Design a protein around this ligand. Structure first.
Ligand SMILES: [Ca+2]
Ligand SMILES: [Ca+2]
Ligand SMILES: [Ca+2]
Ligand SMILES: [Ca+2]
Lengths: 305, 305, 306, 316
């Protein structure tokens, strides 16, 4: 039973990090695909040597052809133009990639990163024909990583012991659910009651979370290390059948009162892809914000067509 | 620099697994101490060879003298007779061990496993003179691992994505708190509302959790693999300054309306030992069960003296 | 893919360690099989809880039925009586286990631990009908771990930076090859010439390596932790297609001038099982020792056959 | 107790990968230091979020001040000129960067001496064997506490290429490249093993040919150039090699790793740094292993050292 084959459609900064992490974790053979000539081969060569340091045995190859999607177990899509004017252009890219997925790897697990993700993931779902349980978009794992981390540094606890939920869409309409924040499994409100962190501090953290991509772009460049790690967490849960509860963009079929659209919600990721879609029991305020996120996704989807 | 020194006071079944895991994780040099002659040297020799398989470099040594406590960074006490008649006998074991700790490693971080833990950890605290933030008892990490695991199997999610709190005492008066169970950070109640698990199933799991040690004894022996892993999780948090929120038996100084006694509650474990003691905001009914647990610890503490 | 299924035929102390390490490494679901009713279920329950501590998701189940070999990807055989009087008794056990492997998992990767391993592995091969690339015996990984570790102590280097080769058979006739010892890839002779370790010290280490099991038993302990870790290293190389070079008991078909017998030699373990069998280019002195090891394996196999 | 503090002097592509791997392995708190404004803070912020995914707790911060060297346990220097400022590719050569990077080593060395005189220093600035000695001289750090990257990176290429011809786990190939990190690197064919077995046995069995090896050797020496010619650049493997060295130090692993270290008579050389196997543990360079080289190998070692000396003379 051979290694998983993981094809990275897009070999930019996020691609490079993903390939690095895949080798570190010995997750599978890697293809770095890009339309840019030669570059993916150079990155692939550089990364391949790290098998020695990592005590791994993963092949890492570059590619300039979609034909290398053949036999892929996991496809991660970061390719795309980098706002509203790009929607129809990136739709065409999803049509192209989707057609190649359909013929080369129709049973692959597909993770879409191309922004705006909630729109682009549905466009690829439609153009590739893959089942709803085998395609998801990056969102909540990345967004909550910021919220979890910032709260952890205020409370002086292990970052992953903060859990949190951000839903609806990946972008400015992301819905931060204060009521669903826990610290070591304990409601955050208890820490607020004890004066360990204030409502004002939290509002500042919420604002920072929403604007993190902009903050980092202003300082340096579009974030890529945390996005890569978030994607690999998702990919690993699939490949190792870990059944982790992770927030991703997934097809809504009545959840939150919505359908024929993708939105961010907790899901269980295992060997069968999206094994469960978990509908949070939202109150009216939270729901209202969820609906606003979906409306913005629907608006941009209309423009993409 | 140099490596941590971890002394296992008791080289029985739990000790053997601890030494194995320490080498796997390259956590520090190990001393397997026991009153039984030769045996700890034999287990140490066997375990030491696993450095090759593990790509680690941890010394593993046997000992029959408390002088090997000299320079210990972590001390883990599993020694003791294995009910109420044993309390004064194990009190004398805690007096002996405490005296040697005070002499050889007064600044070590101490983890007590000797049952009943909540009593024995306080006795060792009093006889060793160590600070209250440097001595804890095994309890909630082990007890909650059972609860978390059983729920994860019913819901088909990653075991560690279930978080749960069991407090008060490690033993038959352990307090299982339904309200503080989460799944991927989502309250367990949501899953109950969705009919994914019933309250009857949950009650059965609660009963199974309380009686797990007995169940395992009736099939084999007093559990040792999970206890060992739970202890190493705690020791690792200390040694690597992870600041994990872990439930342990710790000195209460007013929390839950109790003092001059040790009880199970969530704490933060990092380089400074017990960095925080977290008091759950229990309702009156939960608090009443907590008081029953403490009452029993106090009852047995009186008999120990 | 769904997880690998690993069936431990024998759930003694060695099995417990194997199950523990499998969960730590998230290597696959685990079945603790044994011929006593309750114990494997007890051990399985205890170990299953460690998924929480390990952030793993491996099922750990007890079993009293060979039907649980169905769907097995790896089968690790430690069952048997625990000297030459035991040979035909354990052969009878290999006949039964081999029959159930043939029936339930004819293409599983089989690792045999039951002593004497070079005899027992061939017996199971014959009684199971599994291909020669899918059945190996524990030996060299364990024996060399001892030699590697003791040398590393003397020289004060990382234990795994010592590499060494012990071949022929797992047991008292094991052939320690001084010529194939390296430290960080550097021949050990350089360290001897430099007076960092002496020939006398090395001889003592060789003696200690051969007698390690006896030493541990004389210390009122039982050797099972390192044997378990060695077996898991082998199983992992197979399951993750690492293609590690590991010394295991394997079917010889001409190598070293021997055939129709299993002996210890470096092999490459990957997704196709034994992908390569590496024959060390031994000199006449080393060859003669190898021959003594094989002769002893043949002697014991004759006592085992029915 | 508490965590090690690791300061990355230089927050470029190698720095970025290093920070990522440090968090993955929970090795220590990280400081991304650079002269460039804002960028190290942005990289640090991005990387810090990965603590959640990795179940780690390493602080990652950006810095534009040498004050952050205070309390450093490990200092990794990737800073330096890789091209002549404002010059086109045709009017500078490698030798021109030597006196410029000397001045950088003087500056960094002075701040190390002031702020962390006993930190473990790993120098990556090319050509390493020159620059590590310059930093040693300008910082006054003890000889057991300063090393240069070379052999771990160069051998990873050779080990990897051989492994894919022989179809074995990459790390089961062991190999030694010594003398210097650069075009004069000395590939020791005689010392290559595969699962501890001399490579020659595999050549004897026709599993790989002398010609194949010779092509592999040439590819190893020219890998950096091959990667640059493919419109990429080598920073992932360099970062992983550096972290393997730092990890051996911080975890007291006592791994045998080939690094640039001060020679005090080994191979007949002194007052110079060169690549040789060392043992890295809690006391830094715990052992310097002198290989018993034959004449052809010794000749190439001497050539590598002569080139390092030539470049050092220009750097001064
Ligand atoms: Ca984004
Ligand atoms: Ca108990
Ligand atoms: Ca044996
Ligand atoms: Ca270079």
């Amino acid at each position: 039973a051979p290694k998983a084959k993981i094809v990275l459609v897009g070999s930019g900064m996020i691609g490079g990090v993903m390939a690095t992490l895949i080798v570190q974790k010995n997750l599978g053979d890697v293809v770095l695909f890009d339309i840019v000539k030669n570059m993916p081969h150079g990155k692939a060569l550089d990364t391949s040597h790290t098998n020695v340091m990592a005590y791994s045995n993963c092949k890492v190859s570059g590619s300039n052809t979609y034909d290398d999607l053949a036999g892929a177990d996991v496809v991660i899509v970061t390719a795309g133009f980098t706002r509203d004017d790009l929607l129809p252009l990136n739709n065409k890219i999803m049509i192209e990639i989707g057609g190649h997925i359909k013929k080369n790897c129709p049973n692959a697990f597909i993770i879409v990163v191309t922004n705006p993700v909630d729109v682009m993931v549905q466009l690829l779902h439609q153009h590739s024909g893959v089942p709803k349980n085998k395609i998801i978009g990056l969102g909540g794992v990345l967004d909550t990583s910021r919220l979890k981390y910032y709260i952890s540094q205020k409370l002086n606890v292990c970052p992953r012991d903060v859990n949190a939920h951000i839903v609806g869409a990946h972008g400015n309409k992301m819905v931060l659910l204060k009521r669903y924040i826990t610290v070591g499994g304990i409601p955050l409100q208890e820490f607020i009651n004890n004066k360990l962190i204030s409502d004002a501090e939290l509002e500042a953290i919420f604002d920072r979370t929403v604007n993190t991509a902009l903050e980092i772009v202003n300082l340096h460049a579009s974030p890529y290390v945390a996005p890569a790690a978030a994607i690999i967490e998702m990919a690993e849960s699939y490949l190792k059948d870990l059944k982790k509860v992770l927030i991703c963009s997934t097809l809504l079929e009545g959840q939150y009162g919505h359908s024929d659209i993708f939105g961010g919600t907790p899901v269980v990721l295992g060997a069968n892809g999206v094994e469960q879609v978990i509908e949070l029991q939202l109150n009216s305020e939270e729901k209202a914000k969820f609906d606003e996120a979906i409306a913005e996704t629907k608006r941009m989807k209309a423009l993409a067509h």
